[PDB]
Point group: D2
Chain length 141, copies 4
């Protein structure tokens, strides 16, 4: 009473809540993160590099790992960081600066462009990890 009707709550409440929870889940995939292999390591062992979103969603954290992790990678421990605010664009495939030259690698390549003319270049280990980053970056941006 005496105005308004729960008939409205499908559009006014249920719909935005569902969009929000799907948004949050696209972002939480990034918070969890991905371990990438250091492809040009020429160390005796395999070397790894981790990238993940901070818990408040405002900062990318990334850095070298001595081993592939079997659990959570604390973000503050990683060497490097990138304010999400400082991201200009995400580019994909042939558009990536490290891809100017191979059909399968192009499907896995993405780059984050930031600042002056800086770029954080990736080659995802598989198409699921690739989709996690590109979809999560779309949500973020």
């Amino acid at each position: 009473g005496p105005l308004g009707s729960p008939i409205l709550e499908l559009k006014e409440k249920i719909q935005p809540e569902i969009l929000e929870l799907i948004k949050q889940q696209r972002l939480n995939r990034l918070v969890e993160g991905t371990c990438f292999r250091k492809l040009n390591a020429r160390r005796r062992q395999d070397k790894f590099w981790y990238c993940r979103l901070s818990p408040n969603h405002k900062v990318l954290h990334y850095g070298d790992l001595e081993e592939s992790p079997q659990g959570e990678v604390p973000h503050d421990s990683l060497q490097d960081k990138l304010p999400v605010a400082d991201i200009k664009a995400v580019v994909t495939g042939k558009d990536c600066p490290h891809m100017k030259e191979n059909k399968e690698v192009l499907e896995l390549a993405f780059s984050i462009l930031y600042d002056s003319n800086c770029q954080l270049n990736f080659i995802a280990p598989d198409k699921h990890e690739y989709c996690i980053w590109t979809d999560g970056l779309n949500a973020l941006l």
Copy 2:
């Protein structure tokens, strides 16, 4: 080619918005019995309005009483093609809420009033029987038009 990780954004999310949208519209397909406005002595005092199953036309027609069963789309005299709708207005902005003489409405019914403007001179004027039917129509018409 292309991971199932994408189907939250690309499949589940639009299919959920489509379900919600279709439900808002199907509430008008069911339709509503309205009190007839400017009804003379001895004329039918009700009329029914419902959206066609394909969501393309509003069917409507007078009724002698509030119906106990379903009123099929085809049995209603009149059609208003949805494409012909200019706008929906509510409350004080409805022509039937601007009557000055014997046709004036009680102000008590202001929160219940809406009109569909079509064809740059015409209205379908409504007074909802209640606030829930009001919301069915205004929310349903939002879905049919903008959102």
Copy 3:
């Protein structure tokens, strides 16, 4: 450890059912003004019933008129702890729909009647003002109890 492919079943699906559930319950938190039953000459002719924000207690109390603003939970005389509810009955199975004398209800209101049975002798008896409020209460009580 453990893929994001699982979060359709394990995260999105339960969070959607929880949203829907919480909405059905929050419709009772808003509550409804009911017509007072067996009201004597000069007694308050309305009463309000609403669920506590934590969904644990039904608050209710008499009102002199149908309220224009919100009726806060705390201002209502009486509490019925949800845990104390045995059952919900409807229509012909409501005690107030079995009255034989001066307290009998018009049969027209049968589809609007429901009662909450509590404490193995007591009822809160309701006649919903309309079919939409009826559904708010019956659907809301289903969510509070079974589903």
Copy 4:
């Protein structure tokens, strides 16, 4: 009119439709399928083996591939088939008959038990494919 209210459609319509579409999506992941490497091939090349659900959801189809596919694998072309009706159980990890003996492989192992005491044993290529099969089999069963 004159009975019922759209207030009911959250519980009676929206809720089951959403469960159904999520069900359908867990099953469609299987319809698309997964290419598995033939780990004990000792052919000159890599050999592959595909497994997928039929479009009507009633039959598993699987068989050897000469190459990793870059597209849709028609199900009728695959050598073998398994009525879903004939599936007794899905077992996981240490419970798998091919796992009686290695923490990372156990996380990827699953077996479909069918018929007499038959078993179709798998080692998923990655944790995403593993989850696609186990979640999809749960939906199916």
